[PDB]
Design a protein around this nucleic acid. Structure first.
Ligand SMILES: [Zn+2]
Lengths: 129, 185, 150, 81, 87
RNA sequence: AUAAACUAUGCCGACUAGGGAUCGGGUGGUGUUUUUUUAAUGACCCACUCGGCACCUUACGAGAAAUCAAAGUCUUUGGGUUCU
């Protein structure tokens, strides 16, 4: 069965960036996928996305603008202390000076850079570059 | 006086103006004496439409929104002519209960009808009352604002076709959320 | 796919995007309720009241015109069955295989297919005890299985 | 291909898609108003009905169940509402 | 890409495909630089003044090069009613 | 309860490519044929669709290669789980 809908959504996006498409359609959608796409949007990694309202769970269509190399999920959502974040950014980011690791703190879903200036930590979701 | 028995206790002068608009049809009464006698409302908010017009919001206690929906289309005609420069709509005064935090506990588990995301959905179902909604889309723009989109039924659309500009102003004043209405064919 | 086979079929109903009755319906929200309990007093399960109502009386589905699901109307009227019809029709099929396998026990496939049906009974009765639909132990027995279907 | 309007597919494509594979899933069935020759009453019949529907009066036949749409019997005028 | 004092580094900046927005590598020998003449009244294509499109060798191998130029040139006014957004 | 108990390829879920066949069900046709004059079905034709056993061409991808639409989405390394 479906174990996590975030992994399916990020697999769908990653497969269509490789093939050359400019849009995806993911199904289903959740608040976690909406927030993860919102973090991707504000850093310019994806374009506009529209949420189709079913009565079931909804679908999302996301416009792609090139310039995305990978969006991935980390399963399980490991607990990350505030001193372990630079052990993750060193592991699965291509360089020390771009790319983001998206976490889930009690202050909300956010990338690792402004989890640092907010001085919060939590569980890890994934990465984009 | 039957004018004063519709409003809450005292207020207000504007509540009397709509109150006289009901009794001019209750005393005329082709058929309305059998259905407009028990129908009563709670309040009017005046919302400034972005055009030259304004909007009238009629709040209903909602054991009776089904009762109001029987004469909804006909009564709005006899409210727009004796109140010029206005658009009259009927809403239900729903209650929104706050989401319990990990400290702000309560008793009596909060029903899903009292959640805020369900009340705002019932506003759109009640703003437009005919022309059942056939879909919804939400655009997450690049800048960061969210724009809804309400798709309306194409049939019977000529009763509210001019009021799409008014509805976007009313829903913005009650929710703070942008709306565009689109009519597919 | 299916729980106890390799089939991957997706055939299913598809509920429309509307929580309101269609404009042509115009019977009532209450005369349908009387028609719900008229069929239940004839010993009809909720699955076969809905197919009977949709095919003949033109209700699309009983929730969108009443607000209630069908066996919530039955339970509010005191016509709820002892065990759910979901579990009842699994037990009845298990009794039918046991009676068959009683006299020709050379079927190695009816012995296999019995195990799948009984496993499905245990998985479903486990769920019903948790949500307090069934009494806390209730212990489906094969020797008393034929008593419950009649 | 590689640029498509996935929010507004053409009506032909949505019509030729499966019932669940559209942008929003929904039923391809409908309801019918049929006139039996005997009486003149209003009877609403599901297009994919499974019961052998009869009228309230004189109860002959109105449709026979099939593995697809119900086969409406010999001549009875039908509307689609 | 630059240093602290804004002085440019990275000895060349590469071309990017106008269809899929990906880098044209120095060894993509299937990549193509399409040059389209600009025209004025009574025909007479102006020499040396172009409308240029770059296509990566990935797109051309996939068979998307024709559908891409139909989109890439209709949006620039070079065509009309040839490429349709809704398939 | 042992087999080259074999597809020497665990099971469930999602995505990525083009095609023509075929088995079962379904939908449509101011289609063909069967005869009563066409009708009703049946058989067939065309188009679509769901679910199967498969096949053909390529290789964006993978591989040590043989080859593989999965043995792909894998140093840009994390969907769930069992066994070795
Ligand atoms: Zn009859």
């Amino acid at each position: 069965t479906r174990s996590s809908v975030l992994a399916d959504a990020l697999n769908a996006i990653n497969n269509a960036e490789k093939t050359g498409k400019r849009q995806v359609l993911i199904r289903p959608s959740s608040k976690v996928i909406i927030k993860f796409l919102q973090v991707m949007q504000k850093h310019g990694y994806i374009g506009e996305f529209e949420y189709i309202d079913d009565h079931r769970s909804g679908k999302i269509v996301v416009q792609l603008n090139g310039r995305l190399n990978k969006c991935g999920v980390i399963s399980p959502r490991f607990n990350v202390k505030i001193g372990d974040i630079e052990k993750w950014t060193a592991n699965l980011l291509p360089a020390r000076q771009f790319g983001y690791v998206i976490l889930t703190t009690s202050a909300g879903i956010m990338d690792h850079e402004e989890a640092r200036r907010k001085h919060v930590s939590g569980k890890i979701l994934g990465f984009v570059y | 006086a039957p004018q004063a028995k519709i409003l809450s206790q005292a207020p207000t002068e504007l509540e009397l103006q709509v109150a006289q608009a009901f009794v001019e049809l209750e005393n005329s009464s082709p058929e309305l004496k059998a259905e407009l006698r028990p129908l009563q409302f709670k309040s009017i908010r005046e919302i400034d439409v972005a055009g030259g017009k304004k909007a009238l919001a009629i709040f209903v206690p909602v054991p009776s929104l089904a009762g109001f929906h029987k004469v909804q289309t006909k009564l709005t005609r006899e409210l727009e002519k004796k109140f010029q420069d206005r658009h009259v709509i009927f809403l239900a005064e729903r209650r929104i209960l706050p989401k319990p935090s990990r400290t702000s506990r309560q008793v009596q588990k909060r029903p899903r009808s009292r959640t805020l995301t369900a009340v705002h959905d019932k506003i759109l179902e009640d703003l437009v009352f005919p022309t059942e909604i056939v879909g919804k889309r939400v655009r997450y723009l690049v800048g960061g604002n969210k724009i809804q989109k309400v798709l309306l039924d194409s049939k019977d659309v000529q009763q509210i076709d001019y009021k799409l500009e008014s509805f976007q102003a009313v829903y913005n004043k009650l929710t703070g959320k942008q709306i565009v209405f689109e009519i597919p064919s | 796919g299916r729980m106890h086979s390799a089939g991957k079929g997706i055939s299913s109903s598809a509920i429309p995007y509307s929580r309101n009755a269609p404009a042509w319906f115009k019977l009532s929200s209450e005369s349908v309720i009387e028609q719900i309990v008229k069929y239940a007093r004839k010993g009809l399960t909720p699955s076969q009241i809905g197919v009977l109502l949709r095919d003949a009386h033109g209700v699309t589905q009983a929730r969108v015109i009443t607000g209630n699901k069908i066996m919530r109307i039955l339970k509010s009227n005191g016509l709820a069955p002892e065990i759910p019809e979901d579990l009842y029709y699994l037990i009845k099929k298990a009794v039918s295989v046991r009676k068959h396998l009683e006299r020709n026990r050379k079927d190695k496939d009816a012995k296999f297919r019995l195990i799948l049906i009984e496993s499905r009974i245990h998985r479903l009765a486990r769920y019903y005890r948790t949500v307090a639909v069934l009494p806390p132990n209730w212990k489906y027995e094969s020797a008393t299985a034929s008593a419950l279907v009649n | 291909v590689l640029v498509q309007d996935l929010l507004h597919p053409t009506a032909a494509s949505e019509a030729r898609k499966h019932k669940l594979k559209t942008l929003v899933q929904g039923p391809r069935s409908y309801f019918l108003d049929v006139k039996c020759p005997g009486c003149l009453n209003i009877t609403t019949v599901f297009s994919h009905a499974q019961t052998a529907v009869t009228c309230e009066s004189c109860s002959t036949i109105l449709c026979t169940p099939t593995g697809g749409k119900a086969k409406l019997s010999e001549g009875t005028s039908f509307r689609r509402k | 890409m630059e240093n602290d004092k804004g002085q440019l580094v990275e000895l060349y900046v590469p071309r990017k495909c106008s269809a899929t927005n990906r880098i044209i590598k120095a060894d993509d020998h299937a990549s193509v630089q399409i040059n389209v003449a600009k025209v004025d009244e009574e025909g007479r294509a102006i020499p040396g003044e172009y409308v240029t499109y770059a296509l990566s060798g990935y797109v051309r191998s996939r068979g998307e090069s024709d559908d891409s130029l139909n989109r890439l040139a209709q949006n620039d006014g070079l065509l009309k009613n040839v490429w349709s957004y809704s398939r």
